Design a protein around this motif. Sequence first.
Motif, PDB file in Angstrom:
ATOM      1  N   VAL A   1       2.477  -2.659   0.109  1.00  0.00           N
ATOM      2  CA  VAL A   1       3.163  -1.628  -0.664  1.00  0.00           C
ATOM      3  C   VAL A   1       2.121  -0.837  -1.426  1.00  0.00           C
ATOM      4  O   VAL A   1       1.284  -1.382  -2.160  1.00  0.00           O
ATOM      5  CB  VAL A   1       4.141  -2.293  -1.651  1.00  0.00           C
ATOM      6  N   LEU A   2       2.148   0.482  -1.223  1.00  0.00           N
ATOM      7  CA  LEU A   2       1.132   1.394  -1.792  1.00  0.00           C
ATOM      8  C   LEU A   2       1.821   2.263  -2.869  1.00  0.00           C
ATOM      9  O   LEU A   2       3.040   2.375  -2.917  1.00  0.00           O
ATOM     10  CB  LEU A   2       0.551   2.298  -0.697  1.00  0.00           C
ATOM     11  N   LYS A   3       1.007   2.856  -3.723  1.00  0.00           N
ATOM     12  CA  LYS A   3       1.520   3.702  -4.814  1.00  0.00           C
ATOM     13  C   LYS A   3       2.344   4.854  -4.254  1.00  0.00           C
ATOM     14  O   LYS A   3       2.098   5.344  -3.158  1.00  0.00           O
ATOM     15  CB  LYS A   3       0.346   4.265  -5.623  1.00  0.00           C
ATOM     16  N   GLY A   4       3.337   5.271  -5.037  1.00  0.00           N
ATOM     17  CA  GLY A   4       4.106   6.461  -4.693  1.00  0.00           C
ATOM     18  C   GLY A   4       5.134   6.271  -3.583  1.00  0.00           C
ATOM     19  O   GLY A   4       5.446   7.251  -2.878  1.00  0.00           O
ATOM     20  N   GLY A   5       5.582   5.029  -3.358  1.00  0.00           N
ATOM     21  CA  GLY A   5       6.588   4.752  -2.324  1.00  0.00           C
ATOM     22  C   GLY A   5       6.007   4.723  -0.920  1.00  0.00           C
ATOM     23  O   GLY A   5       6.747   4.833   0.042  1.00  0.00           O
ATOM     24  N   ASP A   6       4.691   4.590  -0.793  1.00  0.00           N
ATOM     25  CA  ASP A   6       4.055   4.566   0.515  1.00  0.00           C
ATOM     26  C   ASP A   6       3.795   3.115   0.929  1.00  0.00           C
ATOM     27  O   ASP A   6       3.934   2.176   0.118  1.00  0.00           O
ATOM     28  CB  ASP A   6       2.760   5.382   0.481  1.00  0.00           C
ATOM     29  N   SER A   7       3.404   2.931   2.183  1.00  0.00           N
ATOM     30  CA  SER A   7       3.114   1.587   2.717  1.00  0.00           C
ATOM     31  C   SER A   7       2.199   1.750   3.907  1.00  0.00           C
ATOM     32  O   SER A   7       2.143   2.826   4.532  1.00  0.00           O
ATOM     33  CB  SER A   7       4.387   0.869   3.165  1.00  0.00           C
ATOM     34  N   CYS A   8       1.542   0.665   4.250  1.00  0.00           N
ATOM     35  CA  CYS A   8       0.795   0.634   5.500  1.00  0.00           C
ATOM     36  C   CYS A   8       0.746  -0.786   6.033  1.00  0.00           C
ATOM     37  O   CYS A   8       1.104  -1.742   5.334  1.00  0.00           O
ATOM     38  CB  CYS A   8      -0.631   1.199   5.375  1.00  0.00           C
ATOM     39  N   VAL A   9       0.335  -0.919   7.290  1.00  0.00           N
ATOM     40  CA  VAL A   9       0.009  -2.227   7.817  1.00  0.00           C
ATOM     41  C   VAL A   9      -1.454  -2.505   7.471  1.00  0.00           C
ATOM     42  O   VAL A   9      -2.308  -1.624   7.647  1.00  0.00           O
ATOM     43  CB  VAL A   9       0.171  -2.297   9.352  1.00  0.00           C
ATOM     44  N   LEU A  10      -1.752  -3.730   7.031  1.00  0.00           N
ATOM     45  CA  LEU A  10      -3.126  -4.202   6.935  1.00  0.00           C
ATOM     46  C   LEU A  10      -3.380  -5.049   8.172  1.00  0.00           C
ATOM     47  O   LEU A  10      -2.759  -6.114   8.365  1.00  0.00           O
ATOM     48  CB  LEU A  10      -3.323  -5.077   5.672  1.00  0.00           C
ATOM     49  N   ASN A  11      -4.321  -4.580   8.998  1.00  0.00           N
ATOM     50  CA  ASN A  11      -4.651  -5.285  10.238  1.00  0.00           C
ATOM     51  C   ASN A  11      -5.844  -6.226  10.066  1.00  0.00           C
ATOM     52  O   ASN A  11      -5.851  -7.327  10.635  1.00  0.00           O
ATOM     53  CB  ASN A  11      -4.987  -4.254  11.326  1.00  0.00           C
TER      54      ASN A  11
ATOM     55  N   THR B   1      -2.790   0.522   9.601  1.00  0.00           N
ATOM     56  CA  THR B   1      -1.991   1.398  10.438  1.00  0.00           C
ATOM     57  C   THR B   1      -1.104   2.153   9.479  1.00  0.00           C
ATOM     58  O   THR B   1      -0.325   1.548   8.728  1.00  0.00           O
ATOM     59  CB  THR B   1      -1.193   0.607  11.478  1.00  0.00           C
ATOM     60  N   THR B   2      -1.221   3.480   9.490  1.00  0.00           N
ATOM     61  CA  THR B   2      -0.558   4.301   8.481  1.00  0.00           C
ATOM     62  C   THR B   2       0.497   5.187   9.115  1.00  0.00           C
ATOM     63  O   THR B   2       0.572   5.332  10.337  1.00  0.00           O
ATOM     64  CB  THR B   2      -1.566   5.188   7.742  1.00  0.00           C
ATOM     65  N   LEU B   3       1.315   5.856   8.278  1.00  0.00           N
ATOM     66  CA  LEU B   3       2.280   6.757   8.837  1.00  0.00           C
ATOM     67  C   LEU B   3       1.601   7.864   9.671  1.00  0.00           C
ATOM     68  O   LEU B   3       2.118   8.246  10.738  1.00  0.00           O
ATOM     69  CB  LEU B   3       3.074   7.390   7.694  1.00  0.00           C
ATOM     70  N   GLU B   4       0.430   8.324   9.212  1.00  0.00           N
ATOM     71  CA  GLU B   4      -0.279   9.384   9.956  1.00  0.00           C
ATOM     72  C   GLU B   4      -0.922   8.869  11.227  1.00  0.00           C
ATOM     73  O   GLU B   4      -0.928   9.589  12.231  1.00  0.00           O
ATOM     74  CB  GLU B   4      -1.360  10.008   9.073  1.00  0.00           C
ATOM     75  N   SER B   5      -1.422   7.630  11.220  1.00  0.00           N
ATOM     76  CA  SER B   5      -2.062   7.076  12.431  1.00  0.00           C
ATOM     77  C   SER B   5      -1.019   6.612  13.440  1.00  0.00           C
ATOM     78  O   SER B   5      -1.344   6.362  14.609  1.00  0.00           O
ATOM     79  CB  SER B   5      -3.087   5.979  12.104  1.00  0.00           C
ATOM     80  N   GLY B   6       0.225   6.439  12.982  1.00  0.00           N
ATOM     81  CA  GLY B   6       1.341   6.109  13.849  1.00  0.00           C
ATOM     82  C   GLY B   6       1.341   4.630  14.195  1.00  0.00           C
ATOM     83  O   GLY B   6       1.622   3.786  13.341  1.00  0.00           O
ATOM     84  N   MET B   7       0.986   4.328  15.448  1.00  0.00           N
ATOM     85  CA  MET B   7       0.864   2.990  15.942  1.00  0.00           C
ATOM     86  C   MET B   7      -0.587   2.576  16.177  1.00  0.00           C
ATOM     87  O   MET B   7      -0.811   1.463  16.649  1.00  0.00           O
ATOM     88  CB  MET B   7       1.652   2.852  17.261  1.00  0.00           C
ATOM     89  N   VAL B   8      -1.568   3.426  15.821  1.00  0.00           N
ATOM     90  CA  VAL B   8      -2.962   3.143  16.104  1.00  0.00           C
ATOM     91  C   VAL B   8      -3.655   2.688  14.820  1.00  0.00           C
ATOM     92  O   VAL B   8      -3.715   3.434  13.854  1.00  0.00           O
ATOM     93  CB  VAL B   8      -3.662   4.405  16.636  1.00  0.00           C
TER      94      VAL B   8
END
Length: 125
Positions: free
Chosen positions: A73-83, A95-102
């Motif tokens: 869980v990231l600041k400002g309602g954001d999130s990412c996968v930690l690989n 893996t971020t919303l901008e990177s998609g699935m990569v």
Amino acid sequence: AMKDPLLNSLIYVSRYYGLANSPEALVNGLPLSDGKLTPFLLPRAAERAGLVAKENRAELEKISSLILPAILVLKGGDSCVLNSINMETREAEVTTLESGMVPISIPLEDLLEQYTGRYFLVKKQ
């Protein structure tokens, strides 16, 4: 174009486990906020994927490699996968919303500044 960061992160993990789930199945019957998943709904979305997700608190550098991928869980309602995290090179693979699935590499410093201290441990049911 995916706009829901938590849903993007959950889809990545579901796929990492070879679980086929439309983003539709994962939100079916859930009361979304402004059309998006929140940390409160994510365990039930994970259940619909065939996963178990549980929110925990830990400092970034205390999260075990063994449990990855995890959803941060990231600041400002954001999130990412930690690989992964490399402490020698001070790089994290995320893996971020901008990177998609990569998964992509980013400086560890950058992830530390956005990370809230809360993450989801995700495993197969």
